């Protein structure tokens, strides 16, 4: 009992083009599909309605890869501008003592570049 | 008839199980090889040459060994299983484990498991030739 590509493509395109007007109930999708589509077979219409009602059962509980609908995309670009008030890299507020930790030859690198005024503490690292 | 002993203590014997790929031997002595309490082999138990080394035949041979040694008074056993050894397979045969289980189930006591297969440091030439058994 495996559905072919014609149903797979028709179910995906109907779901993404017309998401909200049809719901998890199979009976409603049965009359929704044939009114807004031209299908030459009754059983094939049943094939589409039966598989298409299966998708919203799992979409209702978590999103699924490979399917995108109008409501779903708009959520992404509203959420993607999230930004805190204090930077994670910023440590003047994040760390109680502003001064941070580096290693010895990093301090030597700072000496070479001339940025001596940066307040840091050097700790040796070696296991051997 | 048997050794006099208080009910609490139990007396020990030793069973030397020889399991090759053609036959199995169960032989029970008394912590030394001078005296043989009992010996039984698969051949008596089985009715056909093919099955003389079978686990079932080894189980049958172990049952009447336990029965025969029950009235002698011995109540616990040490076991020393060995394969063909020497130039042989050095892997115990199929009828090894069978008899051991039948000995445990029959009511006999067990202690000091051991393997006594003889291994050579450097052996003489072994039978077969330079090309081996070509079948």
């Amino acid at each position: 009992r495996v559905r072919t590509k014609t149903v797979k493509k028709s179910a995906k395109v109907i779901i993404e083009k017309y998401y909200p007007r049809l719901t998890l109930d199979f009976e409603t999708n049965k009359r929704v599909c044939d009114e807004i589509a031209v299908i030459s077979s009754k059983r094939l219409r049943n094939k589409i309605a039966g598989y298409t009602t299966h998708l919203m059962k799992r979409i209702q509980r978590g999103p699924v890869r490979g399917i995108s609908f109008k409501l779903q995309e708009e959520e992404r670009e509203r959420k993607d501008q999230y930004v805190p008030e204090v930077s994670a890299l910023d440590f003047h507020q994040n760390s109680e003592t502003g001064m941070l930790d580096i290693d010895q030859e990093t301090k030597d690198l700072l000496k070479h570049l001339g940025f001596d005024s940066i307040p840091v503490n050097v700790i040796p690292v070696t296991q051997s | 008839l048997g050794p006099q002993v208080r009910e609490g203590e139990l007396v020990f014997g030793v069973a030397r199980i020889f399991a090759s790929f053609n036959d199995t031997f169960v032989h029970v002595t008394d912590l030394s090889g001078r005296e043989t309490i009992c010996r039984v082999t698969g051949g008596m138990k089985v009715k056909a040459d093919r099955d003389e080394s079978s686990p079932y035949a080894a189980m049958l041979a172990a049952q009447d060994v336990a029965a025969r040694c029950k009235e002698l008074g011995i109540t616990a056993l040490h076991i020393k299983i060995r394969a063909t050894g020497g130039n042989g397979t050095k892997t115990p045969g199929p009828g090894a484990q069978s008899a051991l289980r039948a000995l445990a189930r029959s009511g006999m006591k067990i202690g000091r498991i051991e393997d006594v297969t003889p291994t050579p440091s450097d052996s003489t030439r072994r039978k077969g030739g330079r090309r081996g058994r070509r079948l």
């Binding site: - | 079932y56 189980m59 289980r101 039948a102 189930r105």
Partner: protein, 61 residues
């Protein structure tokens, strides 16, 4: 002969050259702790009950 009653708890594939025999895990229904592996000739369901003449013998795998 002390015939014993055993019951099957799980079926593990179908073995044999011709698929007649099946290999199962049985339970002795007298010491619920004990369990061994046996072979059966006929159809077997879960919770079936079998009659065993001898229990010491064991099957392959």
């Amino acid at each position: 002969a002390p015939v014993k009653f055993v019951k099957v708890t799980r079926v593990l594939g179908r073995t044999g050259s011709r698929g007649g025999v099946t290999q199962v895990r049985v339970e002795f229904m007298d010491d619920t702790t004990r369990s061994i592996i046996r072979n059966v000739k006929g159809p077997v369901r879960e919770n079936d009950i079998l009659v065993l003449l001898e229990s010491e013998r064991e099957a392959r795998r």
